[model samples]
Structure formats: C-alpha cells, structure tokens
Target chain A: FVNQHLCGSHLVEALYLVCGERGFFYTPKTRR
Target chain B: GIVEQCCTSICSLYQLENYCG
Candidate 1:
C-alpha cells in the first residue's frame, strides 16, 4: 500500500515530464 | 528520512488530485 503511493507519484511525474514541454494534446505551435 | 518521510502523507494527497483529476 505504501509503495503504491510512491509508484503513483513517479507515474504522474513521468507523464508530466513527457508532456510538460507541450500541452497534452496537439497545440498550434506543434500543428505547424 | 526516506521517501515516506520526505514525501510524507499530504504530498500524495496533492499529487492524487493532480494525477487522478
């Protein structure tokens, strides 16, 4: 249970790290 | 302090909203 908490944070941070540079979905800048 | 102490409890609450929501 405790380890689950840590895993969740890592997952979220990893997701953000990938999408943080851009918005989650396609954006105007990336469209071009 | 390990992650349990570093991240503590409340930190997960905040992350829960951000990630889950």
Candidate 2:
C-alpha cells in the first residue's frame, strides 16, 4: 500500500511476463 | 522501469465506478 494518489484511478504493477501469465494486468477494475 | 501499460487511464473513479461496481 506504499503508493501515491491512493484516492483515485490506479493500475496494478507486477512482473507477470512469464510463459503466458494468465489473469494478469489490472485496470483498477478490482476496486472502484 | 515503467511502461505505458502501467497507468494509462482517462477516467474518474466514480465515473467508471458505477459501471465496474
């Protein structure tokens, strides 16, 4: 939770570039 | 190392929130 702009749109960042990293990339869709 | 895919957005949380949630 160490991030700025915590009260607005946010995208998650993670290293999921593996062999077909399924269920990756977040559009801040999880939490409105 | 950041990319365009990290935080490319054009919307207000409440604006899109109504549809997403």
Candidate 3:
C-alpha cells in the first residue's frame, strides 16, 4: 500500500489510486 | 455482464487482476 510500485497483489490504494473508470472519480480524491 | 463495473472494481483491487463473476 506504500505505492512507489505497481506489480500484482503487491499493489494497494493503487486500486482506485491508479486504476481506471470510477477510479477517475476515486483518483483525485486520493488527489492529495 | 460481469465484465462491467464490478469488472473495473476487481482489477482495481489489483489483488484481483480479473473480472468478478
């Protein structure tokens, strides 16, 4: 969940933090 | 129909990497 990486289940917030679609909305929320 | 919203939700899960039938 620390991010700085994107490989398999090893990913976390990346789910909506860097995925697609709804993430578009969920992303910016992670917008810091 | 599984290849829809939930679809994205899953892979979005990353831990999934696939559709959620």
Candidate 4:
C-alpha cells in the first residue's frame, strides 16, 4: 500500500490519526 | 479519496499528473 497515497504526503498515518467521534468510554483504541 | 490531495507542488511544470481517485 506504500505505493498508493490518500489525503496528502504519503498519507500513511492518516486514518486513525484523524480525530473522530466515539461512543462508549471502554471502546478499544484503533492503533495508528 | 486519493483525489483530495494534489501531488503537484501546486506549480507549473509536472511529470505524471496523476489525479488520484
């Protein structure tokens, strides 16, 4: 997947790096 | 969306001009 780019510079650490809303406090963390 | 980010340094001369999907 390194050959592909998404939002910007390589866009590697984007997905979870981007902030988003959550529900429960015990929700498992999506490791970036 | 890959197309969201422009690879060309927002300049004139370019190479692939690959407009991402």
Q: Number of backbone collisions per candidate, in order?
A: 0, 0, 1, 0
Q: Which one is best on TM-score?
A: 1
User: How many Å off is the CA of A31 in candidate 3?
Assistant: 22
How do the predictions measure up, each by TM-score? Answer: 0.23, 0.19, 0.21, 0.18
DockQ of each: 0.05, 0.05, 0.05, 0.06
lDDT for each candidate structure: 0.35, 0.32, 0.32, 0.27
Q: Model 2: per-residue lDDT, tens digit, B1-21?
A: 122222443334343223322
Clashing pairs in 2: none
Which ten residues in a row are the worst by lDDT in model 1 chain A? A23-32
Tens digits of per-residue lDDT for model 4, A1-32: 22333334333244323322332121222212
Determine the iRMS, in angstroms, of model 3: 11.7
Worst 10 residues of 2 chain A by lDDT: A11-20
> Per the 3 Å backbone cut-off, how many clashing residue pairs does candidate 3 have?
1
Candidate with better lDDT, 3 vs 4 = 3
- Candidate 4's C-alpha runs over 4 A off are A1-10, A22-32, B9-21
Query: Against the true structure, what is model 4's DockQ?
Result: 0.06
True-contact fraction per candidate equals 0.02, 0.00, 0.00, 0.07
**Residues A1-32 of candidate 2: C-alpha lDDT, one tens digit per residue:** 22223333233332233112455444434442
Q: Write the per-residue lDDT of candidate 1 for residues B1-21, one digit (tens) a residue.
A: 122322444343343333332
The model with the greater TM-score, 2 or 3, is: 3
Candidate 3, pairs of clashing residues: A28-A31
